[PDB]
């Protein structure tokens, strides 16, 4: 157990040969073991500082942005009032850097969708969020027959209402999600084309997210939807060094090779602050 | 007492007179798949002595301007020995690993190495290994200064000449294919460059030896 | 779910009310309080000086 930090015991001076706490051999590969009460003269301190804020749940159970959907009136992206979005977390840096500290995670989720006009104004309009598992029919238009949601879960909500939220279980075939996959997903020959599938893990492709404005004709307002994600019941394994350089592509550790930068800041000389 | 060492398994033996103890990866010895973890229905094969032995891969030279090298596991052994033959004749594979790195010099040489094991080493942009191009960012956008969080050891030419790491099976599945997934990658980077004065022997080779432990195979078919 | 009713007192912000609110920092522990001399426990204590 470790509910609080360790105390400090009273120590005195020592002058004896043979026992040397200070000298070490870091070539072995293990951290130090010399403490404060073994290299200087210390007093008695009763530490009562809590360590409950550094747990995995306390560090990951905070909402963050992961998605963005645009439904414009005039444009080229989604001019038909419907959109399809594949579920990915690696789209934004703040959450990605946090979740990429470890290799395997197992967790539930709580998704919250906030919708408003591009100017921030709220107007009366109705929508339908539909969760499309892999292998289900994906809608292709605003009046697609697949919108009957006979089996797939769906949510009807209005803009003027408070943002809708749902709870999500752990749906992976594996024992945990993995953000790094050193290998290929097919038994092929890997000549050149397969290299575009390097690291593509099928165990992380959880489905598709579909949104439309309920109606037959075109709507009257442009709309934007923001998807926020929060983690709970989190377990982690095998931590790895944190990210250093900028991100370039989703689900790819690629970095700008010509512009490489140090981790921290720099100074002029080593003998001067 | 932790200065001499002998490691034997199968029909091979390794001796060293200047060691730096033994690091057990994540404090867990390799073991077999328990009856509750298994998912297959066919009884697996455990060749035991015929695939658990030390193999010597290749020799790389250490120069005063070297960058570093890395290998992939278990990709190196798929064309070597009975372990290679069984890997291509079966679909599911699991095993542990014991890795030994040897590099020796005289008392008038100097330099240091960083031996580490990094699971799921995805590389951004065989049995002979590759040479790093941007060792500062590990060729994957992460700083090398934090590599010590992984199981690691050092080769200081004034103290020792070898490093030993024992790594269990690391994956999210009880069994996996050996021809499409590389569980981990071994890294050897010179942090402090080699240095000597003219007249000393200028060739300081580095050789890698390793041995699978507690192997298992299942899903027999034709060789692929 | 459970059927309820709303009494004519909703949505008002009353300054002197005592109510429960959602915390912003989950699992937060404040700094321990050491002994500081001169504590006041009632405004009437210093009304007699």
């Amino acid at each position: 157990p470790a509910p609080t930090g360790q105390d400090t015991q009273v120590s005195s001076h020592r002058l004896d040969t043979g026992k040397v706490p200070a000298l070490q051999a870091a070539e072995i590969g293990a951290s130090s073991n010399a403490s404060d009460e073994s290299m200087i003269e210390t007093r008695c301190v009763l530490n009562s500082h809590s360590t409950a804020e550094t747990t995995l749940d306390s560090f990951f159970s905070r909402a963050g942005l992961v998605g963005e959907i645009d439904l414009p009136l005039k444009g080229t992206t989604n001019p038909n009032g419907y959109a399809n979005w594949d579920i990915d977390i690696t789209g934004y840096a703040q959450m990605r850097r946090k979740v990429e500290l470890f290799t395997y995670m197992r967790f539930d989720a709580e998704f919250t969708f906030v919708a408003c006009t591009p100017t921030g104004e709220v107007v009366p309009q109705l929508l339908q969020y539909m969760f499309v598992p892999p292998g289900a029919p994906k809608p292709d238009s605003r009046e697609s027959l697949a919108w009957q949601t006979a089996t797939n879960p769906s949510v009807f909500v209005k803009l003027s209402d408070p943002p809708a939220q749902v709870s999500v279980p752990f749906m992976s075939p594996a024992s945990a999600y993995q953000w790094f996959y050193d290998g290929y997903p097919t038994f092929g020959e890997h000549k050149q084309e397969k290299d575009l599938e390097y690291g593509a893990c099928p165990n992380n492709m959880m489905g598709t997210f579909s949104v439309r404005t309920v109606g037959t004709s075109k709507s009257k307002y442009p709309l934007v939807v923001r998807i926020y994600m929060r983690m709970k019941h989190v377990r982690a394994w095998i931590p790895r060094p944190m990210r250093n350089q900028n991100y370039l592509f989703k689900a790819n550790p690629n970095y700008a090779g010509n512009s490489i930068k140090p981790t921290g800041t720099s100074r002029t000389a080593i003998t001067t602050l | 007492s932790d200065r001499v060492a002998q490691l034997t398994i199968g029909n091979s033996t390794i001796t060293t007179q200047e060691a730096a103890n033994i690091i057990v990866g994540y404090g867990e010895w390799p073991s077999y798949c328990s009856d509750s973890d298994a998912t297959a229905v066919d009884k697996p094969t455990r060749p035991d002595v015929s695939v658990n032995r030390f193999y010597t891969l290749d020799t790389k030279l250490w120069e005063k301007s070297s960058k570093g090298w890395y290998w992939k596991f278990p990709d190196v052994l798929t064309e070597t020995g009975v372990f290679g033959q069984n890997a291509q004749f079966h679909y599911l594979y699991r095993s542990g690993f014991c890795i030994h790195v040897q590099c020796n010099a005289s008392k008038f040489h100097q330099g240091a190495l960083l031996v580490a094991v990094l699971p799921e080493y995805v590389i951004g942009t065989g049995a002979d290994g590759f040479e790093l191009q941007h060792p500062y960012v590990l060729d994957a956008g992460i700083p090398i200064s934090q590599l010590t969080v992984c199981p690691h050891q050092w080769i200081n030419l004034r103290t020792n000449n070898c490093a030993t790491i024992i790594v269990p099976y690391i994956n999210a599945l009880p069994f996996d294919s050996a021809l499409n997934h590389c569980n981990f990658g071994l890294l050897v980077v010179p942090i402090s460059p080699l240095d000597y004065d003219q007249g000393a022997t200028p060739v300081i080779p580095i050789t890698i030896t390793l041995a699978p432990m507690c192997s298992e195979f299942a899903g027999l078919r034709q060789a692929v | 779910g459970f059927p309820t009713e709303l009494k004519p007192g909703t949505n008002q912000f009353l300054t002197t009310d005592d109510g429960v609110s959602a915390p912003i920092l989950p699992n937060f522990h404040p700094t321990p309080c050491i002994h500081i001399p001169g504590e006041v426990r009632n405004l009437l204590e210093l009304c007699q000086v």
């Binding site: 157990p1 470790a2 509910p3 072995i28 590969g29 293990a30 951290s31 073991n33 360590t51 409950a52 747990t55 995995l56 749940d57 306390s58 159970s61 539930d108 709870s167 999500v168 279980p169 752990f170 709970k232 019941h233 931590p239 | 103890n21 033994i22 690091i23 057990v24 990866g25 994540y26 404090g27 969080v149 199981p151 024992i166 | 989950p26 699992n27």
Partner: peptide, 30 residues
């Protein structure tokens, strides 16, 4: 944990158990 539905994964995060094993990563020496 507080739950109002028939599914355990719809409950709150709750309070975990304070345990640490620092020797797993810092002192893995045999």
């Amino acid at each position: 944990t507080i739950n109002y539905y028939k599914d355990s994964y719809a409950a709150t995060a709750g309070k975990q158990s304070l345990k640490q094993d620092p020797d797993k990563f810092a002192n893995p020496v045999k």
